[PDB]
Design a binder for this molecule. Sequence first.
Ligand SMILES: Nc1ncnc2c1ncn2[C@@H]1O[C@H](COP(=O)(O)OP(=O)(O)O)[C@@H](O)[C@H]1O
Ligand SMILES: [Mg+2]
Lengths: 49, 457, 460, 409
Amino acid sequence: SLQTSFVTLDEAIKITNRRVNAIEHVIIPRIERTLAYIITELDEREREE
Amino acid sequence: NYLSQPRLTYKTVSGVNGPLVILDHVKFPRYAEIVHLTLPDGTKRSGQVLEVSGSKAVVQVFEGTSGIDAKKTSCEFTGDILRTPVSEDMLGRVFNGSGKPIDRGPVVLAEDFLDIMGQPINPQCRIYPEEMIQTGISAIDGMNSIARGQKIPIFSAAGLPHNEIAAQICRQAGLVNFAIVFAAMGVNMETARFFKSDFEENGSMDNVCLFLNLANDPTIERIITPRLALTTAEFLAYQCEKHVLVILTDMSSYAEALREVSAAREEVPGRRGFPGYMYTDLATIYERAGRVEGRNGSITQIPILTMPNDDITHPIPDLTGYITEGQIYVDRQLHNRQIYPPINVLPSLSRLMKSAIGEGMTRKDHADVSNQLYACYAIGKDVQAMKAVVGEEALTSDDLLYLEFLQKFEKNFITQGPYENRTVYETLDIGWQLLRIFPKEMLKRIPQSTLSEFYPR
Amino acid sequence: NYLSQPRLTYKTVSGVNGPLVILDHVKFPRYAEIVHLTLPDGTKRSGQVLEVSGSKAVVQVFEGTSGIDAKKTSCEFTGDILRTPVSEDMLGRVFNGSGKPIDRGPVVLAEDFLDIMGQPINPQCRIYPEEMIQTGISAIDGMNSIARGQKIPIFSAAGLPHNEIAAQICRQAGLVKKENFAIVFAAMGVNMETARFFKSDFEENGSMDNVCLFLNLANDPTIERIITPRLALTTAEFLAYQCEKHVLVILTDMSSYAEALREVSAAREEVPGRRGFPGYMYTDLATIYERAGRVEGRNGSITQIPILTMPNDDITHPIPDLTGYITEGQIYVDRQLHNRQIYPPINVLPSLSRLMKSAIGEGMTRKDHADVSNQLYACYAIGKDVQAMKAVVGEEALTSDDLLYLEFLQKFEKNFITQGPYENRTVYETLDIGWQLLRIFPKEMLKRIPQSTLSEFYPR
Amino acid sequence: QVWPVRQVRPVTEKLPANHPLLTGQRVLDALFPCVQGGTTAIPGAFGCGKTVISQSLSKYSNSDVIIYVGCGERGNEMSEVLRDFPELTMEVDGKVESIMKRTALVANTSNMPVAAREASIYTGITLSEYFRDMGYHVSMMADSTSRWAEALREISGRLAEMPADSGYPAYLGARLASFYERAGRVKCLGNPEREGSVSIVGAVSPPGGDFSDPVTSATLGIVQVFWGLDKKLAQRKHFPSVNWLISYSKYMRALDEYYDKHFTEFVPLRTKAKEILQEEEDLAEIVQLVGKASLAETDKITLEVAKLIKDDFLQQNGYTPYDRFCPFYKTVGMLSNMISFYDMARRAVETTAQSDNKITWSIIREHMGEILYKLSSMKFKDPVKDGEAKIKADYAQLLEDMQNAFRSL
Ligand SMILES: Nc1ncnc2c1ncn2[C@@H]1O[C@H](COP(=O)(O)OP(=O)(O)O)[C@@H](O)[C@H]1O
Ligand SMILES: [Mg+2]
């Protein structure tokens, strides 16, 4: 019981850590680059006006 | 023939606004003419005619308009455009950003007076540059080779060692002597000291010409400083037949002064508020390089850039990369890791490398080894980026080979220290040693006839 | 009565700039008047007065200002605004953007001369349109249905097949069966392959005797685009409201029309709107788009299908943005469907038809048509949300119900949206392809549908 | 004779284009075809390879005349063409001839007067229409049209005109569109009833590298072929740096009936190659977020053959002697073997995945490493040192070499 739980739970820990790393290293940087570009282009449209 | 008719002088200043002074009742104005202004306190300043219309001329004043007035200020018109006196005496001199001496020596006795703006060389008369310069810096020589006559700027940022790299290149350049012409725009005194000290410490100073505009000097001098320097390089190269290396220090100070000048005329803006013509303007500086038909001399340019917020898409590094024949890229992430020189090869390029290397030029492997080192370094970066998500236990042994190559490449091929002077052949064999890690069937940029000759050593 | 008095001719040209010529010493100038210009080499151009002040008039020149000069070139002022000739003999003819022939036939022998701005139709005298056009395309007839007398654009972008959708609508359109169209076709700024494609299709269908073409190609002058939609719609209004025809009007790039307005506005140094377009762009576009529909006591009609190339695929750009504030819908052509070789690439989510609510249903088409459209829409909306979630979490996180929505999303794009260029589906085939997808779910999931519609049509 | 550069030279009739402009690149000629009479754009950031594609197309295409225009670009990029093209030779009647005998150049480098860049473009297209009227098939290269749009911005700025998008004059789109309408295939004027064409290949230099640029955005509304380069392919030394996800050609439906006659087997292979690359793009985000261990053996095979095609078919170094020019027979032969390996590897898994003993891509790799290294080596076979017969014989031998390995599973 404990060992079959433990094997299942080990896999669940690995999956959870993989998701945390993806949010921290793939998803958040892509959002922050996108946000910086939008903030930049809005100043360019404002200078054209 | 000489200008034998006398100069007119005018008190007819009709208005002043920003960096611009506006004269009226001017007798037959000449566009781009030079004007000398005497202020009420007896201070002299100079300016150039930026517009003409009937009896009016608009002057931009290089030292600024502060303390000019509509009544007592007096302007003398020189009859001519901006020309610089040039002679072979200019090697071993120091000048300010408007070409006046600052070494306590005399003014120049001209061998000629040359138009500061230069003149476009005919594409028929250009010779393609093919003689490789060995800088001895492996990250340049092995993977971005410099031909004698190239434009190849150093893209860097604030706090990085681009001064030290540029000094190492000046100290080590030779074929597999240079005369140096050095311009500074907007430098602090410790930067001005560093170069002048290094050129005197290497004994080289009797073969160096310096133009200095420091951070406290006038801004509008910065837009003539590189044109004074390049006019001196064109006399030395294309009349005195020398090989010239021209260093232009912080072109971002030139571009910032150009933006500040253009913003006062209200010319059409491009990206991030720079002038709409900034590409053309930078191109009039960077195209003043190369070899020509029937003359021995040559001009090589190495402009140095500071990228604002490390952004290579900013108009200054962007429009420079569109004109120049490559770039060397200095990386904050390598500098923070205490590597020297911090040259990240992936954003770097040399265009003239492709024909300056290979059989008879360097060695038969050079074009193959270089491309395979780029491929393994790009893949090593992709595996290091995968590791940050999935952790080491997910990596196969093939991923660990690229991730071992990555560590050994940055320690052996990139890292060098400030006075080490590697041959091309050392750089190539340090190349093969890192490539040897991989089983040969992984080396898919390299043909069988190269692998079977150089990998088994 | 006539203008029997002579025409004044002026050599008093005083300035030339972009599309504009400026004259002075003009006697009692008239706003919107037409001017004929004879150049120093005897070339003839034509233009229109955009402004008057005192003795000074500003003329836009339709064929452009190259070769004009301030001394030898002379302008004759016609005394009148722009009136086009019209007749029923214009069906089966080809004209340029100025309305001059290009089929090697003669010029129009008029039945009348009409002001190209038209005349305001009284809101009391319009009829609300309720006959459905069966376009033969399921993504239109099932979920974005078109009434005869509607204004409804196609919103598209560079590289996408909006010309094929337009040509297919022209081949396949008719009423629902429990008349056939006269077609007026205008082109602004099209390339030669586009002009050849449409002309070739109407000849391939064997129906050119029922269509009128006005062509301004990408090498023709840009200021002719200012009048090209107005020549086309003035012809459609004669055919519809005096000859009692049912007219379909195709205007094949409103984006290249709107750029010709921006040139004239920029050359006049007018105060900008968004992206530099004229501040009056809405009010100008509305004069083209509101020339549509039905009138009381006359048997004809005009249906309008504009086409837009959206720049950068931006639906919030001033051209597609303002078009939605005037027209009764949009059909949206999507790059993500096109990149997957789906045809038509129509995305049913941003697409809309505001007049469909009253054109479908019992007595009109079939009693389920309202309910099936709502439920197919809600299933595709949910399936697109499940698809977007799945790419984050993997299929092991999805329930059996999430797999029902994710299955439906594939079967819908493969069978309902995908069709092919010469396939023509009735509304009935469109609805009964629809029900074969709604049967993917158990009855308890079909929340948009009332129990009577489920009871009558689900068991089949 | 003397002609006004701003006025289009007349023709009897424009015609549909019905024949490929072969570039000698494997990408471009397979994935994104162009035609004699076509219009193309090549957008991309600095260092992507626009001038190297222009020079390669100028050296190796099936055109009777080349007109090469360098408005607002480097003097050394002009000097390279003058140095190379006298030395390089095509073969006529069993005799070699310099390709400079078929070439004219129009230079106006990045430091020459800004106003003259407009005159370069109209001079070069007028010279192209002159040889079209003789019944030649002509290609015009315009090595950056952004330099012309940028010249219009200064002249417009000093004329004090109101700007449209990002400072450009409102007429920019009309100036571009009326230039690209000078391309085409034609019945010439006059009475010896000949036909000729002009293809235009305009490079575009978007500032900041972003294709929302007004010149790019205007040009992509006008051209029929888009070869969109990518800096993150160029940094890997992946050349030509063409992004195969965004690029397109509108001429594929016109060329399918040519390929059905001359290269009968190609259209299925083109279709499969696009699907393998589209599938690998859909897998790659799942691989990056989820960490690959979830993939079925079909999907591992799809990633591996997509990598094989990306690294050893699409990629082509333009300077090394075996890959300067890739013939269409070499291109179809290479592609046919990579697609045939996909169908054999998939067949082996798809036949056995139900059984107690079954194939996996790890088994296929370990069993076939010599055939994988032969597939990666196909690019090194040389069109003039080996020749057609030897190339086609070797590629047939690889088909038996992989078939015997799959007979042995
Ligand atoms: N097809 C290629 N094969 C090999 N090297 C290439 C290729 N395309 C580009 N390069 C390399 O990249 C450099 C820059 O190419 P270039 O055409 O000048 O880019 P740009 O788009 O800036 O004009 C070349 O000088 C060459 O070193
Ligand atoms: Mg280029």
